[PDB]
């Protein structure tokens, strides 16, 4: 598999400085130009810069919005590529991608990675409260029950939720978090046969990564 | 200073219609020397990162359905969707690498659908939040189209307008439906006064709302 992981996202304070990371590996990486864009929530991608290859030897360009206050580098020893970023402001919230750019006729991003979120706030980390949400007195004939978690309170983004550890991926909704006086709150259903549940186990697991926040949430009756 | 543009922002196609979309390049994208148009072509599915689909103008990434066509040269571009598919929900964003690279505004593709009736769910505070000294009511709307929906609360026969968050998911990259979550949260104190919660969702599909409830005393 060529794989491309980024790493370095989290919470970070106006005119602040935070570097990015990305993990490369199962390709040639000298052999590459590597990118990295971003995309603000609900917003439009946008090319950041690149970093050439050892053929063009490694000379970097970037965009006229963030030259002078982002670098890119790389590292050639472990094929790991590098954003470092300052006098972070607002507008930089984002998720940032790293991509596997250009090799010398190729013209195309053929792979990115799954992205890091960056958060630039005043706002202090807060964990979620996790809950569960059971059905109260329904004559549970459907033949589908339905589930919840309400995650609650938190920041900065992202949440992950699963339902048994991935095992149950039909059926579930997560819905997109909701921020409400500087706190984030989100939601997630799953819809099992009423076949099985109660008599089969149903657990919510959450991740908090701002906070090493892991939670795996039984839903009992 | 190369601007990328495209149209329309957003439009909605039924399954096996054909979509086709635009951009623009505020300069040309042919290289005189290569003679290549520049231009890529990304699909974003919800939640994803984008994938390309399509590169100089016209060549298909490979794994890429017939169904997707790039034509186009010099400032002008157009991705065509033939026989679309539900699993063709996403933004398209073109890109342009003539000089660096610039991805234009994107291109929001909804699939339209057959009407659906929500399914509607309620939720009671669990015994863990309230212990907290907060109480969250949920309510959950799911595998609705339209997405077009009203949710009103009702505490004891009547509306409750304060204390409510609602968010919708993006639509469902199978069925091409949409779901809803309203909570609505008081204090334990607020809660504890009052014996029957109402969520009350209002779809064109039906001409009364469809009513899920629950009484506190049969908690
Ligand atoms: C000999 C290196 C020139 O290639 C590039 C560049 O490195 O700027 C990268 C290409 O992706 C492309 O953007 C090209 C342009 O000159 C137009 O093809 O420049």
């Known amino acids: 598999e060529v794989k491309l992981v980024e790493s370095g996202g989290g919470l970070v304070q106006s005119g602040g400085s935070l570097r990015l990371s990305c993990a490369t590996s199962g390709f040639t990486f000298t052999d590459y130009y590597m990118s990295w864009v971003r995309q603000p929530p609900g917003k439009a991608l946008e090319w950041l810069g690149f970093i050439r290859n050892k053929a063009n030897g490694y000379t970097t360009e970037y965009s006229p919005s963030v030259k002078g206050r982002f670098t890119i580098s790389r590292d050639n020893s472990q094929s790991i590529l590098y954003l470092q970023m300052n006098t972070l402001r607002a507008e930089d919230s984002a998720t940032y991608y790293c991509?596997?750019?250009?090799?010398?006729?190729?013209?195309?991003?053929?792979?990115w990675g799954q992205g890091t979120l960056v958060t630039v706030s005043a706002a202090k980390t807060t964990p979620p409260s996790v809950y569960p949400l059971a059905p109260g007195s329904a004559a549970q004939t459907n033949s589908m029950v339905t589930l919840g978690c309400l995650v609650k309170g938190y920041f900065p983004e992202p949440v992950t939720v699963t339902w048994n550890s991935g095992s149950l991926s039909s059926g579930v909704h997560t819905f997109p978090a909701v921020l409400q006086s500087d706190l984030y709150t989100l939601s997630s259903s799953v819809t099992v046969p009423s076949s099985t549940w109660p008599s089969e186990t149903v657990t919510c697991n959450v991740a908090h990564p701002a906070s090493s926040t892991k939670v795996d949430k039984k839903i009992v009756p | 200073d190369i601007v990328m543009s495209q149209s329309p922002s957003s439009l909605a196609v039924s399954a096996g219609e054909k979509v086709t979309m635009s951009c623009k390049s505020s300069?040309?994208?042919?290289?005189?020397?290569?003679?290549?148009?520049?231009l890529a072509w990304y699909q974003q599915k919800p939640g994803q990162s984008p994938k390309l689909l399509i590169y100089w103008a016209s060549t298909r990434e490979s794994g890429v359905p017939d169904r997707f066509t790039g034509s186009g040269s010099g400032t002008d571009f157009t991705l065509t969707i033939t026989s679309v598919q539900a699993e063709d929900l996403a933004v398209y964003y073109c890109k342009q690498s003539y000089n660096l690279r610039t991805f234009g505004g994107g291109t929001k593709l909804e699939i339209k659908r057959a009407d659906a009736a929500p399914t509607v769910s309620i939720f009671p505070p669990s015994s863990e939040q309230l212990t907290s000294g907060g109480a969250s009511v949920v309510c959950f709307l799911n595998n609705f189209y339209p997405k077009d929906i009203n949710v009103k609360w009702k505490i004891d026969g009547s509306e409750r307008q304060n204390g409510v968050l609602n968010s919708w998911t993006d639509q469902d990259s199978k069925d091409s439906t949409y779901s809803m979550s309203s909570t609505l949260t008081l204090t334990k104190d607020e809660y504890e006064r009052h014996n029957s919660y109402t969520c009350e969702a209002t779809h064109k599909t039906s001409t009364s709302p469809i009513v899920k409830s629950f009484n506190r005393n049969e908690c």
């Open positions: 991509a596997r750019d250009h090799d010398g006729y190729y013209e195309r991003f053929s792979y």
């Open positions: 300069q040309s994208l042919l290289n005189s020397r290569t003679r290549k148009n520049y």
